[PDB]
Design a protein around this ligand. Structure first.
Ligand SMILES: Nc1nc2c(ncn2[C@@H]2O[C@H](COP(=O)(O)CP(=O)(O)OP(=O)(O)O)[C@@H](O)[C@H]2O)c(=O)[nH]1
Ligand SMILES: [Mg+2]
Ligand SMILES: [Zn+2]
Ligand SMILES: [Zn+2]
Ligand SMILES: [Zn+2]
Lengths: 57, 177, 101, 650, 176, 47, 57, 115, 100
DNA sequence: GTCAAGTACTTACGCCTGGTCATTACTAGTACTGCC
DNA sequence: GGCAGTACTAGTAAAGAAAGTACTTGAC
RNA sequence: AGACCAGGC
């Protein structure tokens, strides 16, 4: 059930966690470059809910 | 589906009529750039006369009739038309509403007539005065819009494409309102 | 050329008095006979309609019956035929009435 | 499309009608009855969804036309729904006529003279009589003798106004239906339905009818009459109701009011004179699609059945449970109540399955998509496969900039020149160059990949040697041995030459100059398109990785439109303002500042080098068959020209 | 029983017959129609007579030579209506068709109608008292009620007409 | 809203003349705009 | 075979069939071969009926 | 450009059945054309040049008694760098069903490449 | 035999009514940019299907260049049926229409 | 009859190339083995 | 030697931060 | 043929 979470990114929770999004938690480390590869371990994200949103603030 | 018909009268695909003439004068935007550039067309008279060829284009035309009614209205509007628009019982339509501008030579719009008679009055310049006004009315008639032009696509692309270039509401929120 | 000819052009057969894209179908011929194109909707059953040897045709099941041979081929897109398949599942009927009758 | 295969018949119109249950029992190939799709050993079971009478399925001949997979069109079948159920496309209008109607005299609850007032205003709107419908309304507790005199003069005014307008050249007997009479008809039916729904008593016989309730779909309820006004139904001398009884009411209401509902359900005059029926709003028979249109998806072993077979199985599963619930009633309180309370639940689940097959958002129980939701949005059917389509004979590649191209041409790669091909029919003026093309083969520009014979047959040149291929070059211009194909000639699908036409396209196509018709010039080296710099501002195309489309037109009606009408030379001025979109951009503008300067002086070898580097008379840029020059600006000490005098003789 | 129908047919016209539009309607449509059973008339077309192209504009005369053909937008083939007379041999039931006997076999008495059309008289149509001999030299002859072989002509009422196959056949009967 | 205009067409029993460019692509007709706004007729010399 | 290039698109009998006598058939067959010979398997069979209302093989 | 795909012969069966697909060549009349690409194990040689249509591996099938071949489904040519024999881990010792093969593709800088 | 005879007369009475005579036509005497692109395209389909060419072939093998040459000497035997929005039509031949 | 907030069904640039993971519980059955 | 317990097997059943109109139920 | 993810212009 952790291998399903890491290979898909989908969150399966019955006591639904404090954060809003339910998918997009794991991302393939590319190793397409080394500037690409170290950039995965320093990137921050706000949420997938904030992506499909109309505001700009 | 709105498009120029063979009546020079733009209308929808099902047959309902949007306008009686495209822009009020039925002239194509891609052909009306040098239409009122009269100082350019006078300097290039003998070279523009070749591309319109006035002598070979008289037999399929009515040169005689639209010019007379364009003088009945030009003389009427200089005499009248000091009063405002609600008083004007006009008694005479322009030659576009009575004569086909794609067939009748001299059936031009009224801004084209009032700017040619304003240009050619001021300056007096082997081309005489009447061979220049006979070649602009041929330049006007060839610069008519062709029947079948997908006008409303062009009219809606001319608003949607410049909209990408973008104490009252303003811009693309104003166009949505 | 783009939206019709080089994408999904088909010359499907249309029943002329039904105006139906996906009703008419190939008749199963006899030995030496020819397979005509014929309609399912405006063709009556043979035991229902009790003939001149040319209005009579037969399915593959053996259901021999007599009726609609008023049909012709019209160039349509194939997605129009898929539209009628979905829209007749809704209970909606389309009559593609053709001009040469 | 094949220009050597005509068609004489054309669709003129369409019209949307309701597909009745009597037709789709005669239309049907074979009724399918059990909810098993395919049994063991990979065969389709007879009587199920995948059947051989519904079309050829998976390397097996059809049982209706006897054809294989490539030639069977697929056939219509049906199921027999045992009870009449609600069609979800018409339930919002079925619930209007189920309401607003008397359950005792079976008219509507309006008075019969005001229902007649809309029966003959809508008749005047079927014909082109938008103005005579208002003169009709200018005609005027009450005894029922003068009301017949009122209904007479209103009916005689219509029969005189229709007779006058059809005689005075205005309206056909098929009626006139413009746009502004669609306004006055939609305004009149919406007013008629709004006034039907607001009635207390039936104004024909004055007593109440119980109001119906719709909470959600799949069910209808009627409410009990109030404890106060039961007195009105004793001086005339909640409940779930069945869909057979809802149909039994409206099979009487539409018969007692046939003379009115013929005009509500027709925009144009009914020349067929068919009855309008309550069976229109119900569906006693589902139509299964042809099995060609519901073939299963396949990804290796991962084969899944189609979503419609999952939805049509659940209707067949309920359609057999509802018959097995009729076993005890066929044999016959406790033995009667448990078999009836489970039968009524089958009525709701067969409705909830016939809704979910048609509309997925009218389901309940992430849901399986119905037949409405294959049509609605982007990724539908009208917008994904009708207004926009995938096309044949079209390439896409990255563009690279290119001078030395004549501003109306595109530079095509060799590997686009090999794959894209054009049908040339052989004639007396082709067998010099179209015999040479078929000798060259599929992999030698300019060549050919196929020959289409007169019979519709098609011979590929790919797996052929040159000795086999020169023999077919002597087969092209031969007289046909078939009389039935004597006016047809062979088509050689030659490669794209330098004289063909090409339609280029960069997304987003914000205006029509972003999709122009260019000429062609093939290039020997690399795999990219080559665009001249005067076209780079019309497509809004830069060269940091833009790729843009290349559509190759396939007949002479389309070659004559992207050379004369959709041409790139006709698109100099845009129709937005009348301003040009075409011109030189970055290096050429910086060079004319230096060339047309006063400092630019050129000697005789320099001056004549820049002219032949741009004119080149043999490609047809000059108009004199000899390059004329000017006398120099300076004659002493040595002759010099000027960059003004470059562009003068250019 | 040769009969005359004037018909109206809607036919194509290839561009190789643009200079000869009357010749192209005949060769493409009318000449493959003679000596075949046509379904929409009821017999076998013998020949055609009086081909007239209906002109597309009605404002011209039928006396005119130059006519108009409406070109399909997709294909270069034109389409037009045309009038022509067909003389068509139609047999129906109940008629009496004089035929020339072609097959001497014990199964069916084959006979050619007008020396071109196949026909036959079935054995169940033949009555009991008309017998057949066992010829071993060559398939013999039919001994009728008069006690003589039949050869040459044999008139008969028509029972049925076989139209589905390649050529037409006349299922005939000898009893009335 | 495809199946809202669909129901309003089949309730009206609405016949349409296939005039609009969106209605001549569904059924595969030449448009009535521009090049398809007329027909082409061929003068044949013989009657 | 059986194409719009071979067959008519729509075929209609325009008027009712009326029976012709023997003289109009012999006038036709002497005139339909006259225009056509000046489908040769059918001309080989049209002469068999032309030599039927006149004589006998 | 290094591209790797896994050819696996045991994704169409379950639970202890006889393995119907074996690497290598059977005893039937299979065409001797593809000795150039493949070794006697039904596995390709290291370093060989493979265009579209060449076989990636040869396997004998038991339910059909025929040596099928899978093939290289790419329009761009490549060279075979390494072939891995992924062996299964179980108490029952098993013939190989899984092979990983790495391709190298020469990306010489053509025009239209982004720098 | 009786219904088609009546239906043919209605099909030809209501097609003569839609026909504007040659002296009462009032559209443009010029050949538009859309009529030129279809005359050259329809003729080039005919030339490639072995229509009798009325002009001399000076080595040109492109069927569209031949129809452009035939338009220069007005040797195209085609007629434009200019449709009015009523459903009525005007018959303009190519030899009557003047270019540019 | 009616205003009136409240409840409901709708769109939300174009197309282009990749990659991934995509039914689970359980339930009854035939077979394996420990046993006396 | 055959009985019954488990461990498996393959088998068939359930799976929360945007704009507008339109219908309509609320009180009076 | 969807989901999610990474890009291109
Ligand atoms: N419709 C879309 N067009 C795009 C998109 N991204 C890029 N483009 C097109 O590609 C072009 C890219 O231009 P840019 O976004 O880079 C603006 P920039 O300041 O970089 O212009 P330059 O500095 O002149 O290069 C632009 O003309 C757009 O028409 C997109 O997401 N959608
Ligand atoms: Mg860019
Ligand atoms: Zn039918
Ligand atoms: Zn079939
Ligand atoms: Zn009542």
């Amino acid at each position: 059930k952790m291998q399903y979470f890491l290979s898909t990114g989908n969150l399966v929770s019955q006591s639904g966690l404090d954060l809003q999004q339910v998918s997009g938690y794991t991302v393939v480390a590319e190793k397409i470059n080394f500037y690409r590869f170290i950039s995965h371990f320093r990137m921050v994200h706000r949420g997938s809910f904030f992506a499909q949103l109309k505001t700009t603030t | 589906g709105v498009h120029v018909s063979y009546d020079n009268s733009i209308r929808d695909a099902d047959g309902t009529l949007v306008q009686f003439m495209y822009g009020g004068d039925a002239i194509d935007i891609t052909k009306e750039s040098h239409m009122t550039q009269f100082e350019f067309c006078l300097d290039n008279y003998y070279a523009l006369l070749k591309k319109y060829n006035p002598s070979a284009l008289i037999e399929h035309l009515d040169v005689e009739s639209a010019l007379k009614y364009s003088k009945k209205t030009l003389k009427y509007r200089k005499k009248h038309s000091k009063e405002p628009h609600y008083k004007q019982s006009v008694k005479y339509d322009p030659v576009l509403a009575k004569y086909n501008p794609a067939k009748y030579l001299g059936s031009v719009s009224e801004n084209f007539q009032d700017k040619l008679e304003s240009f050619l009055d001021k300056n007096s310049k082997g081309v005489n005065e009447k061979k220049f006004r006979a070649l602009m009315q041929l330049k006007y008639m060839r610069s008519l819009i062709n029947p079948g032009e997908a006008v409303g696509i062009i009219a809606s692309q001319s608003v949607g494409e410049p909209s990408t270039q973008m104490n009252v509401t303003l811009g693309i929120p104003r166009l949505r309102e | 050329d783009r939206l019709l000819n080089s994408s999904d052009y088909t010359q499907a057969s249309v029943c002329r008095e039904c105006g139906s894209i996906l009703t008419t179908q190939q008749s199963v011929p006899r030995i030496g006979s020819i397979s005509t194109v014929c309609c399912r909707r405006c063709s009556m059953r043979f035991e229902d309609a009790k003939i001149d040897d040319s209005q009579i045709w037969e399915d593959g099941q053996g259901n021999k019956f007599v009726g609609g041979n008023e049909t012709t081929t019209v160039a349509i897109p194939f997605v129009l035929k898929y539209l009628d398949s979905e829209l007749s599942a809704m209970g909606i009927r389309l009559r593609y009435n053709v001009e040469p009758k | 499309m094949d220009i050597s295969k005509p068609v004489g018949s054309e669709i003129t119109s369409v019209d949307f009608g309701i597909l009745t249950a009597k037709e789709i029992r005669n239309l049907s190939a074979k009724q399918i009855t059990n909810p098993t799709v395919l049994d063991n050993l990979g065969h389709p079971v007879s009587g199920g969804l995948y059947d051989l009478a519904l079309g050829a399925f998976l390397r097996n001949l059809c049982s209706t036309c006897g054809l294989d997979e490539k030639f069977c069109p697929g056939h219509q079948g049906h199921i027999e729904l045992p009870v009449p159920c609600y069609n979800p496309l018409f339930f919002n209008q079925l619930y209007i006529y189920l309401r607003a109607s008397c359950l005792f005299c079976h008219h509507f609850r309006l008075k019969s003279v005001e229902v007649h007032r809309y029966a003959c205003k809508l008749r005047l709107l079927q014909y082109g009589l938008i103005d005579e419908s208002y003169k009709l309304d200018e005609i005027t507790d009450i005894s029922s003798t003068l009301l017949n005199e009122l209904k007479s003069k209103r009916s005689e005014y219509v029969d005189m106004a229709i007779a006058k307008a059809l005689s005075d050249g205005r309206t056909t007997e098929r009626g006139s239906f413009t746009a502004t009479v669609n306004d006055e008809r939609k305004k009149l039916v919406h007013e008629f339905h709004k006034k039907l729904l607001s009635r207390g008593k039936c104004d024909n016989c004055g007593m109440f009818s119980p109001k119906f309730r719709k909470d959600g779909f799949t069910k209808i309820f009627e409410t009990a009459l109030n404890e106060k006004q039961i007195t009105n139904n004793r001086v005339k001398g909640s409940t779930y109701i069945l869909s057979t009884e809802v149909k039994n009411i409206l099979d009487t209401v539409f018969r007692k009011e046939q003379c009115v509902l013929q005009y509500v359900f027709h925009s144009r005059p009914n020349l067929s004179r068919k009855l309008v029926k309550a069976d229109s709003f119900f569906m006693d028979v589902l139509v299964v699609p042809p099995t060609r249109f519901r073939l299963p998806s396949k990804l290796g072993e991962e084969v899944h059945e189609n979503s419609q077979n999952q939805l049509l199985s659940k209707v067949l599963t309920t359609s057999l449970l509802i018959r097995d619930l009729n076993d005890d009633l066929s044999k016959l309180l406790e033995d009667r109540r448990v078999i009836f309370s489970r039968l009524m639940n089958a009525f709701v689940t067969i409705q909830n399955d016939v809704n979910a097959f048609i509309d997925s958002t009218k389901a309940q129980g992430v849901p399986i998509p119905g037949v409405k939701q294959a049509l609605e949005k982007k990724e539908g059917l009208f917008r994904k496969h009708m207004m926009g389509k995938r096309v044949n004979y079209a390439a896409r590649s990255v563009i690279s900039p290119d001078p030395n191209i004549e501003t109306n041409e595109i530079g095509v790669p060799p590997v686009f020149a090999v794959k894209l091909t054009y049908p040339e029919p052989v004639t007396a003026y082709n067998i010099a160059e179209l015999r040479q093309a078929v000798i060259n083969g599929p992999d030698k520009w300019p060549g050919a990949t196929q020959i289409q014979n007169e019979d519709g047959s098609l011979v590929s040149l790919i797996g052929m040697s040159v000795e086999q291929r020169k023999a077919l070059a002597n087969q092209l211009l031969t007289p046909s041995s078939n009389v039935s194909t004597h006016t047809l000639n062979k088509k050689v699908y030659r490669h794209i030459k330098n004289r063909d036409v090409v339609l280029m396209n960069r997304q987003p196509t914000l205006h029509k100059a972003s999709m122009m018709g260019h000429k062609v010039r093939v290039l020997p080296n690399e795999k990219t398109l080559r665009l001249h710099y005067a076209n780079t501002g019309a497509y809004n195309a830069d060269f940091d990785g833009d790729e843009m489309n290349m559509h190759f037109p396939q007949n002479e009606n389309a070659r004559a439109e992207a050379l004369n009408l959709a041409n790139t030379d006709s698109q100099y001025l845009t129709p937005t303002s009348g301003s040009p979109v075409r011109g030189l951009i970055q290096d050429h503008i910086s060079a004319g500042v230096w060339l047309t300067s006063k400092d630019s002086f050129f000697t005789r070898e320099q001056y004549q080098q820049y002219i032949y580097g741009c004119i080149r008379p043999e490609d047809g840029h000059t108009t004199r068959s000899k390059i004329v020059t000017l006398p120099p600006t300076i004659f002493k000490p040595y002759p010099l020209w000027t960059g003004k005098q470059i562009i003068t003789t250019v | 029983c040769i009969v005359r129908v004037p018909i109206a047919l809607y036919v194509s016209l290839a561009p190789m017959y643009l200079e000869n539009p009357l010749q192209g309607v005949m060769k493409q449509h009318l000449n493959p129609l003679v000596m075949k059973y046509n379904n929409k008339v009821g017999g076998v077309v013998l020949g055609y007579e009086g081909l007239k192209i209906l002109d597309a504009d009605p404002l011209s005369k039928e006396d005119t030579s130059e006519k108009l053909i409406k070109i399909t937008p997709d294909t270069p083939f034109g389409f037009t209506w045309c009038h022509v007379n067909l003389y068509v041999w139609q047999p129906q039931v109940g008629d009496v068709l004089e035929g020339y006997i072609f097959i001497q076999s014990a199964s069916h008495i084959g006979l050619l109608i007008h020396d071109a059309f196949n026909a036959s008289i079935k054995k169940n149509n033949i009555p009991v008292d008309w017998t057949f001999v066992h010829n071993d030299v060559e398939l013999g002859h039919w001994v009728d009620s008069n006690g003589e072989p039949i050869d040459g002509k044999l008139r008969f009422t028509v029972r049925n007409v076989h139209t589905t196959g390649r050529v037409v056949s006349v299922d005939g009967t000898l009893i009335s | 809203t495809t199946c809202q205009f669909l129901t309003k067409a089949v309730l009206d029993n609405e016949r349409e003349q296939l005039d609009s460019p969106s209605a001549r692509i569904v059924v595969g007709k030449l448009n009535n705009v521009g090049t398809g706004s007329f027909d082409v007729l061929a003068k044949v010399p013989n009657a | 075979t059986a194409t719009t290039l071979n067959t008519p698109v729509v075929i209609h009998a325009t008027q009712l069939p009326q029976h012709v006598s023997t003289d109009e058939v012999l006038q036709f067959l002497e005139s339909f071969i006259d225009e056509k010979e000046n489908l040769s398997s059918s001309i080989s069979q049209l002469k068999r009926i032309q030599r039927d209302f006149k004589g006998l093989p | 450009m290094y591209k790797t795909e896994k050819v696996d012969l045991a994704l169409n069966r379950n639970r202890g059945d006889p393995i119907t697909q074996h690497f290598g060549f059977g005893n039937d009349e299979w065409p001797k054309e593809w000795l150039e690409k493949l070794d006697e194990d039904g596995l390709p040689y290291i370093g060989t040049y493979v265009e579209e249509g060449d076989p990636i591996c040869a396997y004998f099938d038991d339910t059909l008694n025929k040596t099928k071949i899978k093939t290289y489904h790419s329009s761009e040519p490549a060279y075979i760098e390494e072939v891995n024999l992924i062996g299964d881990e179980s108490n029952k010792f098993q013939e190989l069903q899984t092979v990983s093969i790495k391709y190298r593709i020469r990306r010489t800088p053509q025009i239209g490449d982004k720098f | 035999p009786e219904d088609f005879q009546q239906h043919e007369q209605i099909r030809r009475k209501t097609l003569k009514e839609k026909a504007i005579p040659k002296d009462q036509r009032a559209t443009t005497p010029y050949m538009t940019k859309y009529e030129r692109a279809r005359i050259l395209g329809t003729r080039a389909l005919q030339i490639s299907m072995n229509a009798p060419v009325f002009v001399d072939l000076e080595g040109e093998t492109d069927p569209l260049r031949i129809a452009m040459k035939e338009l220069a000497e007005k040797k195209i035997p085609l007629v434009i049926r200019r449709y009015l929005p009523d459903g009525s039509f005007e018959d303009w031949s190519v030899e009557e229409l003047i270019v540019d």
